[PDB]
Design a protein around this ligand. Sequence first.
Ligand SMILES: [Hg+2]
Ligand SMILES: [Hg+2]
Ligand SMILES: [Hg+2]
Ligand SMILES: [Hg+2]
Ligand SMILES: [Hg+2]
Ligand SMILES: [Hg+2]
Ligand SMILES: [Hg+2]
Ligand SMILES: [Hg+2]
Ligand SMILES: [Zn+2]
Ligand SMILES: [Zn+2]
Ligand SMILES: [Zn+2]
Ligand SMILES: [Zn+2]
Lengths: 194, 194, 191, 191
Amino acid sequence: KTASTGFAELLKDRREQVKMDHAALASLLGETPETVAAWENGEGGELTLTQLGRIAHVLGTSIGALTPPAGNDLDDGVIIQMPDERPILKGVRDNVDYYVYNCLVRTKRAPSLVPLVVDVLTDNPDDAKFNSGHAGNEFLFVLEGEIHMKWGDKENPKEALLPTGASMFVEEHVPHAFTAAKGTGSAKLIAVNF
Amino acid sequence: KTASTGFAELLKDRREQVKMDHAALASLLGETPETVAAWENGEGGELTLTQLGRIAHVLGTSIGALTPPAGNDLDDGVIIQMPDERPILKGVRDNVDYYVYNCLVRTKRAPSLVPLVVDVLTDNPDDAKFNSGHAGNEFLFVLEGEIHMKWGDKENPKEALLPTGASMFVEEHVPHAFTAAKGTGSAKLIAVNF
Amino acid sequence: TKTASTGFAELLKDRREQVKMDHAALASLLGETPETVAAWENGEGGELTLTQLGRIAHVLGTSIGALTPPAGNDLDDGVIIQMPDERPILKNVDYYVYNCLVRTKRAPSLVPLVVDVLTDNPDDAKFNSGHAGNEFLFVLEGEIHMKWGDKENPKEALLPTGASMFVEEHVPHAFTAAKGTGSAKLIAVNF
Amino acid sequence: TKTASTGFAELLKDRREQVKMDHAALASLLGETPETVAAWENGEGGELTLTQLGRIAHVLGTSIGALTPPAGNDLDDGVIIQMPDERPILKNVDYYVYNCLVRTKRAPSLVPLVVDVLTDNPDDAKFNSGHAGNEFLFVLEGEIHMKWGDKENPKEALLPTGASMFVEEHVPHAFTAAKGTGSAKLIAVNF
Ligand SMILES: [Hg+2]
Ligand SMILES: [Hg+2]
Ligand SMILES: [Hg+2]
Ligand SMILES: [Hg+2]
Ligand SMILES: [Hg+2]
Ligand SMILES: [Hg+2]
Ligand SMILES: [Hg+2]
Ligand SMILES: [Hg+2]
Ligand SMILES: [Zn+2]
Ligand SMILES: [Zn+2]
Ligand SMILES: [Zn+2]
Ligand SMILES: [Zn+2]
């Protein structure tokens, strides 16, 4: 139910898995057997990131293997966000907005799902600044106006115009950048990273 | 480059993996060693689904392990669909349309990605017919009007109203159904199964 | 068949519905009638060729593997045993005998072997090019001379009885018995 | 530390950027200053407690594991060896001795053991409740009496030297040496 109960359980499981008793694990970590027992009784909440790294190391695993998954924030399998709930970040250069990011619903049950409405306020394709690609795949859909999309190698990009209603898939690790089509003022798209 | 070259390569790999020569594999399948060799030389294109099932069985694996992945239809990591390319299926009951499905971009590199614009033509929540849930997760976003969403157990559903701009996540295997809000005529949403 | 065609029948239907194609839509793309597509979804797809399956998977934007069922279940309440008398052998030809241990469709990548290592000249060790998966090894009898990495300048280890080893996916490796000791035996578990 | 804090630093930044939060946004949600969040992303997060990490992961809609680096690499060009003299032991207490074979951070679920089985009374076999992963077993010495499934009415097998077995994830099982044969030995590979 918490980081430390989650840890207590996963710690005990791993330790038993590798056939160590409290004393063996304690001897590897500069603690008493009693202290290791306390962790497994849910008293590990004040362990530091550094100490957790050492525990994972001596158990031949990662901190992730010893900590609980993200958790469940769903309501019988669903989560809903109303339109006046959306968080917003602005893409700014020299106190000029280039993008506004309208954050749509997210869930701990699918952490890589990041959907956004992007207001695209630059209509100078020169302004497009390449990222370096995502860990995951991405789906885009043009809601308003027309997008000038660039992808691949920032030095010699591939480019395309996407009118309203166009849809696109960008594979993991593919660098990309976009603005509105030259001189057309502004555009809007939905981007779903997953 | 084809089903049969893909198979030829995967067949040889598996057979070598389990330490069988052509003769051993041939003796399990009612063929000569030469025939099995021919398959590995790319001559398996006329093998039936049934015969493939038997080959997979005797090799202790699945037909999928012996056939190539979906393939690559991307253009330097991307695929784009223009708005007048979209395929359409209609949800019809007694020659009355309830839904129109406007199929957005798909790719063999991520087969479970199925994005749709759904025109919702029924505004009677009684008309909502539950599916039985998806293999994958689903993201929804209301583009026009207002949606009456139902989910969970069809006998005692959970329900919510989603106005324009609302967004929603439905976990794998969660049954759901939707119409437009009662009496409001019609609505439109984007649904991204992934 | 029953399982392949019945499994194909169910997954075909699921996938078709998933991409919002009715029988008529799918049938047209394949040059078939809707009744033919219906017949496949009724379990009558057993005579479809590998090439035809490739085209169905293509039009459905997916793979043959996605439209076909997993390997079956050959376990007896979660377990499968192999008795020592029941091992298949393949004799890296004449100087290694491969005694195949238990395998299961529920974990097709698991391939455990007892390898009889009959060469004791490390100079003749022949490097493979690496496995697709990891490997665990345990020296059962004798003493093994293991080589790995770059065949031109390999890492090496002399491994007495009871030694154990892990070889990561794609790492080239070779073994012989230790120079002049005759023969050795290991258990190799590819997983 | 270096690796945990440096790894946290990089993944924190990636995730923050991914969900479109600047330092100030993240800092406010955590009751911290933006300079503090900047300091973490500069490798100064080593003293963060398990509880504080839980809250950072919570606000970022993810897990601690997603914000922390994988287990390191302890391999020598793709390989790790363990010599027979180097086995850790745990003595299912007094009648099983567990001799730990080679393990690696590159495959943390791989736990191979030599199990010395010192009880030869099948009546006393104690059932575990099943593993999280699969298991491969090979009878090294003697003869094993294996039980599995329902402890109330188990499936059983007498397994002579050289027998091999696969036990699927979550299947309860127990073993002793065969009645009155004294002792036995197997290699168990959990993977
Ligand atoms: Hg945000
Ligand atoms: Hg935002
Ligand atoms: Hg369609
Ligand atoms: Hg469609
Ligand atoms: Hg074999
Ligand atoms: Hg064999
Ligand atoms: Hg141990
Ligand atoms: Hg041990
Ligand atoms: Zn992107
Ligand atoms: Zn759905
Ligand atoms: Zn090998
Ligand atoms: Zn076990």
